[PDB]
Design a protein around this ligand. Structure first.
Ligand SMILES: OC[C@H]1O[C@@H](O[C@H]2[C@H](O)[C@@H](O)[C@@H](O)O[C@@H]2CO)[C@H](O)[C@@H](O)[C@@H]1O
Length: 358
């Protein structure tokens, strides 16, 4: 629709890069003009991997208008560390994104535990090395975006967590510099790096960034929990006071790094409540105004507020099939409240929700 000129497909935009625009670093296509990516995140491929199918990726690219998709490969929580076969879905997903003209974020979904250096995540370097080797001479290699650690956090379920401060950021930096260097040996593909407190801290990254090209830093927000703000931190505010996630994004951009909202949801961060649509409006107007790409959480029919698809609810609904079939569209009532809203926001169309009574 109108105002969608920056939301270009990879066939048009080509290799991504960061350019200075208004004294801030922003995502751009090959020709230097700003590019913004909008799309969806899978839930963990070990639980809801059936979304990686032909008709669903066609639906998300054409009917929903997405020019990007994110593949969330958990490692702990029965992901890649214990079932290696989840990696097969990352490959299949890249192949379909290639085919249906979407950039694809390969996400090493650090989560439980929250320290990316934990033993359970020891396969990270080899994982990224393997995938990058497979695709380095492919003509569509530039479609791939690497995301090295979903959410550095204090989560200690399955190993150590991290602190919300410089020590925490230095732990992530320590983890990522080897992998960045090896990935830069294989190509120039964008690398998105998470940061403390469930990637709410791009501002810490701005204060001590990785010395490499095409590195962007994550922000993750859930509109039921992370309140919008218009006052940026005063010049010289120490990191100890930087608690507001929106102001943390403004600080990162104002202090010279680029940002990518690699995961956001319409619920509270505790997974549910809402959806919170007037605040998601304020947040997406903020992202869109500042050319920050975004991926919404998530492509599941699980019965949780952030889930994009209608769940099974005994008295009222059957769960939407994660393959939409040959028509390659999911009908409006097969989308949950969140899914229906996010599809309209990815498309850039007016939000006109169906009456869920009838
Ligand atoms: O249903 C699959 C698993 O879900 C896990 O909860 C997820 C939640 O659904 C997501 O929104 C995100 O918050 O991550 C959560 C935890 O990783 C749940 O913890 C597991 O027990 C389920 O098997």
């Amino acid at each position: 629709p109108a105002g969608m000129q920056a939301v270009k497909s990879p066939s048009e935009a080509g290799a991504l890069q960061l350019v200075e625009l208004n004294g801030q670093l922003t995502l751009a296509g090959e020709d230097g003009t700003p590019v913004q990516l909008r799309g969806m995140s899978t839930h963990g491929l070990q639980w809801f991997g059936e979304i990686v199918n032909e008709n669903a990726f066609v639906a998300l690219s054409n009917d929903w208008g997405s020019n990007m998709i994110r593949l969330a490969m958990y490692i702990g929580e029965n992901g890649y560390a214990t079932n290696p076969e989840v990696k097969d879905l990352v490959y299949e997903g890249i192949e379909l994104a290639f085919e249906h003209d979407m950039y694809v974020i390969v996400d090493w979904h650090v989560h439980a535990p929250g320290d990316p250096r934990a033993d359970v995540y020891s396969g990270a370097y080899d994982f990224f090395e393997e995938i990058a080797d497979h695709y380095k001479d492919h003509p569509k290699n530039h479609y791939i975006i690497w995301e090295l650690a979903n959410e550095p956090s204090p989560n200690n379920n399955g190993g150590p967590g991290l602190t919300n401060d410089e020590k925490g950021w230095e732990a992530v930096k320590e983890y990522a510099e080897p992998i960045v260097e090896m990935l830069r040996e294989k190509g120039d593909n964008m690398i998105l790096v998470g940061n403390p407190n469930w990637s709410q801290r791009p501002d810490l990254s701005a204060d001590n960034p990785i010395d490499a090209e095409n590195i962007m830093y994550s922000v993750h927000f859930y509109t039921g929990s992370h309140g919008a703000s218009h006052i940026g931190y005063p010049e010289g505010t120490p990191s100890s006071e930087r608690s507001n996630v929106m102001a943390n994004v403004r600080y990162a951009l104002d202090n010279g790094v680029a940002v990518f909202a690699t995961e956001w949801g319409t619920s509270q961060a505790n997974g549910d409540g809402g959806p919170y649509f007037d605040e998601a409006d304020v947040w997406l107007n903020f992202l869109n105004k500042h050319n920050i790409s975004w991926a919404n959480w998530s492509l599941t029919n699980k019965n949780e507020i952030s889930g994009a698809f209608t769940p099974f609810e005994l008295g009222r609904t059957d769960a939407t099939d994660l393959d939409p079939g040959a028509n390659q569209v999911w009908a409006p009532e097969e989308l949950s409240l969140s899914g229906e809203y996010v599809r309209a926001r990815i498309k850039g169309i007016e939000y006109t929700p169906i009456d869920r009574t009838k």
